[PDB]
Amino acid sequence: VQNIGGIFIVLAAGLVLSVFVAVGEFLYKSKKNAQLEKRSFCSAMVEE
Amino acid sequence: FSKPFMTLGISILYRKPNGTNPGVFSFLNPLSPDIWMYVLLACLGVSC
Numbered sequence: 001v002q003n004i005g006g007i008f009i010v011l012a013a014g015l016v017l018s019v020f021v022a023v024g025e026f027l028y029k030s031k032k033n034a035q036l037e038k039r040s041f042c043s044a045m046v047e048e
Numbered sequence: 049f050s051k052p053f054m055t056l057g058i059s060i061l062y063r064k065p066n067g068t069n070p071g072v073f074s075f076l077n078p079l080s081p082d083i084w085m086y087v088l089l090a091c092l093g094v095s096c
Contacts, residue, residue, distance in 0.1 A: 001080055001082055001083060001086075004079070004080075004083055008086070008090075011090060011094070015094065
């Protein structure tokens with residue numbers, strides 16, 4: 001556990017980063033919705 | 049002394065060591081069992 005060790009940090013912090021880009025995709029697509037729908041208020045609500 | 053009636057030589061002496069019995073689960077062996085238990089946790093963990 002001492003010796004493998006560090007890739008589990010990479011395993012942990014890797015999928016932490018993917019949470020932030022999944023929101024980064026989601027807001028960007030609600031902005032694609034905001035071309036067709038409201039400003040920032042109900043364009044994000046209707047998607048979920 | 050008389051002339052000797054039979055000879056010898058200085059040897060050493062030790063047990064015929066064992067029947068070897070290697071691990072029937074020694075494929076599991078080269079890691080920590082916890083790391084196996086962590087990756088199977090990480091198996092479903094990354095999946096979920």
